[PDB]
């Protein structure tokens, strides 16, 4: 009698170094013909927090399970969804946002193949560790500490020069580098820019001075490996708001991608030389408690279209820049589509080019780079449905690349 068959084996393409924003093809060989199995993906973030997804499958008649050929039958998702084990990842503890800050180390996804379709998993038939990197091949990380400017520059491998982008996130303070590092992998010099509560910067954003942002952009533009003659701006939330403010008041901005930004100045006072924008007013009575114990704050901010709140409207008509607005239709942080439309109306009322707006159905506030799992709530809701939001993230990433390549 011949020995028993060797154990099942997982095969990935690509087998080696995969960036976070890149698709992978997962296959298992050496299962029994038509064997029912459960695949489980597990990830621990830099804070030790667990994220998991699982789906049921059935091997084919050869005992092969290939996720670009076999559909998920149920679990965290169903259908021919090769990347579902990643986009459907859910935190073990509700309310937990994924924490990834050091772009120099990968996030590991542990993949398990477990026997059977029982809700309580069978025996482990095979496993593999799939590392996903945030610093693309040959991308150079260069911290920025020039004048008062604080951020981190990412450059592609030599030779330059490269189109330059300033990258900005919203409120929370500190510096998120992961989008800039990934985007530098597409041929751009990208500066992740901090503006409060990081290193020696002012601890709060009670008042923000656009002069700081002018300095940052001038530094990027003056870099020996940045192409010019202007820069791109990429911002989400308050960061997109700042893209509009920068483009309205400052020179040297060629194009801006605004992701769920606001045309109202919110949360503090903006100053540039003799000019000021007061914060738009709030109405905490407009809060909705639904349909769990979560706040819905989408209606709290006053309209920048009536009363003294018109003062907080960013004068986008003064911008020379081209704009692309990427909005989640289900944004519950604030009225992103309304802001995009009102920016467009302001611009057209002054004979400026009409900006492209892309509105993604069932997508929420946090449109992150691809395969970042949806955070539904963290407490307030942010909006989005897992699959719709995931595919919006994948598409937005291609849209901004195309746009920046065209204009920069």
Curated annotation (Swiss-Prot):
Alphabetical list of Gene3D superfamilies matching this protein:
Acyl-CoA thioester hydrolase/BAAT N-terminal domain, alpha/beta hydrolase
- Any one cellular component term from GO for this entry? cytosol
Would I find Transit peptide among this entry's keywords?
Answer: yes
Q: List the disulfide bonds.
A: none
Catalytic positions are 237 (charge relay system), 331 (charge relay system), 365 (charge relay system)
Query: Biological process (GO) annotations?
Result: acyl-CoA metabolic process; fatty acid metabolic process; long-chain fatty acid metabolic process; very long-chain fatty acid metabolic process
UniProt-annotated location(s): Mitochondrion
Please give the InterPro entries that the UniProt record associates with this protein.
Answer: AB_hydrolase_fold, Acyl-CoA_thioEstase_long-chain, BAAT_C, Thio_Ohase/aa_AcTrfase, Thio_Ohase/BAAT_N
Pathway(s) per entry? Lipid metabolism; fatty acid metabolism
> Which protein, by its recorded name, is this?
Acyl-coenzyme A thioesterase 2, mitochondrial
The organism's lineage is:
Eukaryota, Metazoa, Chordata, Craniata, Vertebrata
């Amino acid at each position: 009698r011949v020995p028993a068959r060797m154990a099942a084996t997982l095969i990935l393409e690509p087998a080696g170094r995969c960036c976070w924003d890149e698709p992978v093809r997962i296959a298992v060989r050496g299962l029994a013909p038509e064997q029912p199995v459960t695949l489980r993906a597990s990830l621990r973030d830099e804070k030790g927090a667990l994220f998991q997804a699982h789906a049921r499958y059935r091997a084919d008649t050869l005992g092969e399970l290939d996720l670009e050929r076999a559909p998920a039958l149920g679990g965290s998702f169903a259908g021919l969804e090769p990347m579902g084990l990643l986009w459907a990842l859910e935190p073990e503890k509700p309310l937990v946002r994924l924490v990834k800050r050091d772009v120099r180390t990968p996030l590991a996804v542990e993949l398990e193949v477990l026997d059977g379709h029982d809700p309580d998993p069978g025996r482990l038939l095979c496993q593999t560790r799939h590392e996903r990197y945030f610093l693309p091949p040959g991308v150079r990380r260069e911290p920025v500490r020039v004048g008062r400017v604080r951020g981190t520059l990412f450059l592609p491998p030599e030779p330059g020069p490269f189109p330059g982008i300033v990258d900005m996130f919203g409120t929370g303070g500190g510096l998120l580098e992961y989008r800039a590092s990934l985007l530098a992998g597409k041929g751009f010099a990208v500066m992740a820019l901090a503006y409060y509560n990081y290193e020696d910067l002012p601890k709060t954003m009670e008042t923000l001075h656009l002069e700081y942002f002018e300095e940052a952009m001038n530094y990027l533009l003056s870099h020996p490996e940045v192409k010019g003659p202007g820069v791109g701006l990429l911002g989400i939330s308050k960061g997109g708001e700042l893209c509009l403010s920068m483009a309205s008041f400052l020179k040297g901005i060629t194009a801006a991608v605004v992701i769920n930004g606001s045309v109202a100045n919110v949360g503090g006072t903006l100053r540039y030389k003799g000019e000021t924008l007061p914060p738009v007013g709030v109405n905490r009575n407009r809060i909705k408690v639904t349909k769990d114990g979560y706040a819905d704050i989408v209606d709290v901010l006053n309209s920048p279209l009536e009363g003294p709140d018109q003062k907080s409207f960013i004068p986008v008509e003064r911008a020379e820049s081209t704009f692309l607005f990427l909005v989640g239709q289900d944004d519950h942080n604030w009225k992103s589509e309304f802001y995009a439309n009102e920016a467009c109306k302001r611009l057209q009322a002054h004979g400026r080019r009409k900006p492209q707006i892309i509105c993604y159905p069932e997508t929420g506030h946090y449109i992150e780079p691809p395969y970042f799992p949806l955070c539904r709530a963290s407490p307030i809701i942010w909006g989005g449905e897992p699959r719709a939001h995931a595919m919006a993230q994948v598409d937005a990433w291609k849209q901004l690349q195309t746009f920046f390549h065209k204009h920069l």
